[model samples]
Target: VETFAFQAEIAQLMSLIINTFYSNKEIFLRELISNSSDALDKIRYESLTDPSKLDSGKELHINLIPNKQDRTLTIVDTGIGMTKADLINNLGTIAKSGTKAFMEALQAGADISMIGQFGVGFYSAYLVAEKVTVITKHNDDEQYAWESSAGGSFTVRTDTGEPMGRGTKVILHLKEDQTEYLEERRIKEIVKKHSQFIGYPITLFVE
Candidate 1:
């Protein structure tokens, strides 16, 4: 397993998100679901030009699995999965150097909508989760797991167990105070409120 430090700007951004969005922690679910939708869209768009992209035959959908015993919420998407490089570049660092300006705007009273515009909505996961694990499989690369605790560093390791076929699975280890997210009713309410119009069907696995 190889580990990497979070970019300076990314660390700062996550601290800000955790503190600034504490009251509206439920928005984390919306942000994550929105990201899953984007991944699905990416795969669909790519398959239009490269038909082989859809050869995996995994239906394009999202699954929300809440494990109350484990205090984790897993969001699985059969979409355009990321390679190791993609995971590093996409999750470990901000693409644009505009984070400073974005931080300034955020401190100046910019709202949650600004996160979407800045393409840093992924960090919003920190608002509810103490740690996040992303296990993804791409057609061109082996399956890998990327893990971080919203700290200064993250780790990426090869996964050789069960093959996920194609897609990404995000497991969020919920914070102690954020365990409400593990409730089926609460999850359903949040999904209905924020992602009812999403293009892909989102299934919630309830036990």
Candidate 2:
């Protein structure tokens, strides 16, 4: 297992998101599902000519599993998962020096829309959850888990969880005040508002 501290700017940005966007806490779901759809699109695009990019007979779909009793929500997809290097570069570090630009805009009292501009949507998960766990399997590597409290640092390791053949699963441990996401109705509404136009199917698992 390997652990790393977030870039100085990333930690600050996460705190800023939690404070500035908590009013629209449900926005995290949309961002996550949108990201999932994007991943699906990427693999699908790659597999169009190179049939080896995805496993045979694996359908592309995103599953939202809400466990109110556990106060958690999980998003699973059979999309292209990231490798260890991809995890670090993609999730560990802020890309394209966007963090510095993001900080400047926030200090100028710019609109929060700039958050998405910097590709900070993933960090928005912290707005409604205390901890987030991601398990992923890449076509070229072993399945692994990446998790964080959305704080100063995060850890990554080979996963013992169920193997996902070329896909990713994100599990959010909701904060005490963020139980509304545990409701199927609320999730459906958010999906309609922001993710309805996504190109893939998104299913909610409820009892």
Candidate 3:
């Protein structure tokens, strides 16, 4: 279990981000992919003993889905996912960062495994989506889904539809005003720029 504290003014930090953080709207895809990459890294180390957790049988990749009809976007991944506690701690309180100690550890020693960091970057999704939903299922736990407007509180629900093999799929219900972000070219560009070198495949859904 991880424990720690957030910077004194996390509200101010979130406000700063909400107000004037991203210069490129597409950066949300980048941040999202970066966080996914980190989670994939964690799965790699954990897979040493638990080989079934790998996605070779279940599509071990990332996906980007855009729906012009419904004005929705989905960024999905077959990687380690958040449990219920993970959803609450991460989306409910930014102070409970899984990456805090990793950053501190990085300073303490250069050999820092970024898998030590998670959650904080997940909040970056708020930069673009008016309402975001993260559907995640851990290999060792029941499937869970998290929904939020990043407007104060978030909700968790049981996973519906077919069961995914131990991974997460993020659904971003984009804002009406931020519709341009729903483009495939835009998402691909942003993801490639920030995540091309990432150790996983980031996919884009056409039509």
Candidate 4:
């Protein structure tokens, strides 16, 4: 078993992002979906040799499930996932990512500005989610469940049951003011706008 630890003052930093940075709550879903594309792109680059690392032996895709009864919005994807070290480096640290590099690229003439640069992509849920759950299975490892309220820490445990091939699902427990993101028509519109021609499939569910 691998042990993971937070890298920097992530708790404090998350507080700053949620409280000061993210003023527009509607961007939470867009950020999540944008981050999903980056995850898929990870495998895509490595697939030049490891072709089988992709989802379903086909192209990558993303899905959204809105469970009104549960008051949750779940974003699912077939993309690369983190190991213990990966999670720690990604979630525990405030600056373990090459975000500066990504942001530089954008300024240098990249086609877009997305969640790819900041490892904060996962934490974007904090803007609207009071509680969040992540279920992930990697092609090279066992399934795991990671949870956080973005207060300070998170819990990690073996998956309860079967795994879902590879990738991750993030379920956001929406804040009282953020429920508008749960609407089907709005979700689809956002998806179409940001993900329509991104070299993959993006799906939205309205139940």
Which is the leading candidate under TM-score?
1
Error of 1 at 59 (Å): 0.9
The whole-model lDDT of each prediction reads: 0.85, 0.80, 0.66, 0.70
Residue-level lDDT of model 4, residues 1-207, one tens digit each, is 333444445565457556764455555677777777887898777887877676444557888999878889999888786665555554544454544444456457752234445555566578788888888876777788887777666778778766677778988988888777889987877766756666667777867
So what's the TM-score on candidate 4?
0.79
Q: Where does model 2 exceed 4 Å of error?
A: 93-96
Which is better, 1 or 3, measured by TM-score?
A: 1
Error of 1 at 117 (Å): 2.5
lDDT measured at residue 201 in model 4 versus the true structure, 0 to 100 = 79
Best by lDDT: 1
| Candidate 4: residue pairs that collide | none
TM-score of each: 0.93, 0.91, 0.76, 0.79
Q: Rank the candidates by TM-score, best first.
A: 1, 2, 4, 3
Candidate 2 residue-wise lDDT, 182-207, digit = tens: 89899888888877877788898984
Error of 1 at 163 (Å): 1.0
* lDDT at residue 46 of model 2 (Cα atoms): 87
Error of 3 at 41 (Å): 1.6
Backbone clash numbers for all candidates listed? 0, 0, 0, 0
Q: Distance (Å) between predicted and true CA of 133, model 1?
A: 0.5
